[PDB]
Symmetry: D3
Subunit: 147 residues, 6 copies
C-alpha cells in the first residue's frame, strides 16, 4: 500500500494512444453568454481547447505517481452542442513509451472542462462538469480497449 | 480576446469556495481499492494530497486565472462503498481581489483524476461523474450555495 | 557582487503597471502561410496571444532574481502588420506590490513572439524576433516612465 | 485551423540539433554598470547564462504546442561585445527525437536576454533585446539549414 | 568556470539506478508529536514519502545542469527509528538513459526530509536534516558503486 | 489526522524572516577539484548559490502543505571552509504574509547543497550533505527564535 512509481524499466517502448471525453452542462444564462462570445474574458471554447493541450503536457506534474514521458501527439476538440445545452470535449494523446497515456487524455479533458467553467462562471456558478471518461486506448499488453 | 481580468483596484476581502467531485467505481475497482489498490499505493491517500497540490497549481492550469496567496486548503476523499463511488470535497480560502472557486474545482478534479490513475489498472472504465461548486462566499456577489 | 533577490520587504505595496512590445519579422512564405491560417498547427496569433498571458504568470520561474508576486491584470495584443511584414505584440501587466512588473510585461512579449516563431517556422526557419522593449511603467518611487524614441 | 501538437508518433527518431543567438543593446549607463559588476544584483552575464540553460529545459512549458522531450545537450554562451555596446547570447541544444529543437535554442537565448535586462534595467529601463534568431539546425527529413 | 551541461548525445544508453538516504533527527517533542499522528497538519511520514517521489520527477527543474530524463522507476521509504530518535528516508530511482540518476535519488531524499521538517516544525524548529548521501549506483562509465 | 494546508486566513500580514544553513562534506579529490574550478561543469559554488535562490521560489511546489507566498527578499551564501574540508551554505528568505518562510530558507540551503554535490559528483560520489538546519526566524505570534 506504499505509493510508488511502478518500475517499468524493463518494458519495451511501444506506440500508445488514448482518447477521453468530458462534458460541461450549461444553464440558459451560460449558453446565452457563450453564443455571444463569452463574458468578456474571451472565447470560452478557444481558451479551453488550448488549456487542454497544455494540461496533457502538465499531467505528470499533476498526477503524483504518473510517469513523465515524451508526448508525440495531442489533439483537443471543444464544441458546443446547442440542442443539448452542453459543451463536449474530446482529447486524443499519443506517445512512444513503456506506459499508457490515458492519464494525459483524461487530464486534457478535465482541465479543458475546468477552463470552460472559468470562462463562463461569471454567468453561472452552477455549471457542472460531467462524465470525464475514457473512450479508447491502444498499446500495452492489455491491447485495445474501447468504451 | 483572452485576458486576465484587471482586479488591481478591487479590495482584498475574505473569500472561500467549496466544490465536490465523484468517481464512479466498477466492482473490480472497488475490490482492488478494498485490498489496498493495484500496487501503486493507497488510492484515496495519494488522491487527497494531489488535490491540495492541485489547488496551488490552479493559476498555472487555468489560463486566465489570477495567481493568489492561498490561506487555507482542505480536501476530503471518501469511499462510499455501497454506492461504489468515491466522493471528493475541497474548500479553499484566501484574502484577495478575486474568488477561489477555480482552486476548489481544480482540487476536486485533480483528486478525482488521481483516484483514476491509482485504480485504472483494474478498470479503464472508471468515470469522473461530475465536478461542481457547492458554496462560495466573499466578494461583491456575496454568498452562493447550490440548490 | 553575488546574485540576490533585492530586499523590498519594508517597501509599501502600490499599484504598478508596465507595458512592453516585441516584433516578429516575416518572410513572404511566413506571411503567406499566416494569412492562410498557419502551417497546420493552428492560428499563430491566437496561440501566441494566449502563450503571452501564461508567460507573464511564469515570469518569476524564468528570471532568477525576479520577485514572485500576484499579478492583478494581464492584457496581450498580437497583430499582423501586413504592409510591414511584421507581427506586433504588446502586453500590459499590473499588480499591487513592492516591486515593478517590467519583467512580466517583457517576458509576456518575448514568449508570445517565440510562439509566433514556433507556429510558422515550418514555413520559414529564418523568422526573426526583434525589438523586445519596454514602452511604459508606473508606480513605485521612480514614478512614471515612457519610451519617446 | 485548430491548435494541435503535431502527431510525430510514427516518425523515425534521429539526432537533432539547433543553434540560435540573441542580442541585448546597451546604453552607456548599462555598460558602465556591467563592467563594474552590475547594479547590485550580481554579475549580469553569469546569471543570464544560467537562466538560458534552465530556460532550454522549460521550453515545452512555455511554448503551447511544443513537443516535450529529453535534452541530451545544452550549451549557452553569454558574451559582452564592449565596443558595440551589445551582449550576445548563443545556445546550442541537442537530443534524439522525432521533432526538432529549434524552440529550445530560441527560448534559451530569449530568456537569457530577458535576464540580462533584469540584471541591468535598474541602470536603464530602455534596454532593448534587438533580435533572437536561428543560426543552424539539423536532423529529421529536411536535413540541415543555416542562416545566410 | 562557465556553467555547461554535459553533452551526453554521444553516450551509451544503459540501465541506470541510484539509491540515496537522508535522516531527520528528532527532539522528544517532535518524536512525541510524530507518534500521535503529527502536529495537526497530517501524518508526517506519509506526506514526506509522497513528496520524495514528486521531487524525483522535478529534479531537472531544481538542479541547473541536470539532464531531463524519463524516469522508469521511483521507490521512496520514510521510516521512524524510534530508539534512535530519527526518521530515515531512502530512495531508489531507475531509468534507461545516457546519464545517471544519482541526483534524482539525492533530491528525492532531501525533499522528503524537508517535508518531514515542515510536518513537525510546529513542535520543534530545531529539527535537523542530516546525512543526505548516496548509498549505491550502477550503470555509467564508472561502473557500479556502493558506499 | 489527514493532510491540510493550515488555515491562516485570520492572521495579519507581517514582516517575516528566516535563516538556515547546510554543509557539504568534501573528500580530498573534491576539495582539489573545487579549488581549480570544478570537474568541467563550471564553478560549483556559483551555480549552487543561484540554485539556492531559485529553490526558495519553488518551495511551495516542493513541500506539499507549504503556503504559496510572495517573497520580498532572498540571500544565499556558498563558501568553502578550507580548514574543515567543508562547504558552508546559508540562506535568508523574507516576506510580508500570514505565515513564516522557514521552509523557503531550509529548501534554498538543501538545493544549493544538492547542486554543490551535482557539480562535484564526478570527482567523488561519496560527498555528503551533513546537515540542513534553521538558525533564526522572526515574525508571527511566537516571535523570534534563535538556534
Amino acid at each position: 500500500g506504499r505509493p510508488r512509481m511502478v518500475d517499468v524499466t524493463e518494458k519495451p517502448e511501444t506506440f500508445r494512444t488514448a482518447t477521453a471525453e468530458a462534458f460541461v452542462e450549461l444553464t440558459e444564462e451560460a449558453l446565452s453568454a457563450l453564443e455571444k462570445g463569452g463574458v468578456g474574458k474571451g472565447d470560452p471554447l478557444v481558451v479551453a481547447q488550448l488549456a487542454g493541450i497544455l494540461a496533457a503536457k502538465k499531467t505528470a506534474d499533476l498526477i503524483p505517481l504518473c510517469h513523465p514521458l515524451p508526448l508525440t501527439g495531442v489533439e483537443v476538440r471543444v464544441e458546443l452542442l446547442k440542442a443539448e445545452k452542453r459543451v463536449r470535449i474530446e482529447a486524443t494523446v499519443k506517445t512512444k513509451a513503456e506506459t499508457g497515456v490515458e492519464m494525459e487524455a483524461m487530464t486534457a479533458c478535465a482541465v479543458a472542462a475546468l477552463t470552460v467553467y472559468d470562462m463562463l462562471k461569471a454567468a453561472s456558478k452552477g455549471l457542472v462538469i460531467s462524465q470525464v471518461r475514457l473512450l479508447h486506448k491502444a498499446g500495452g499488453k492489455s491491447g485495445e480497449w474501447r468504451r
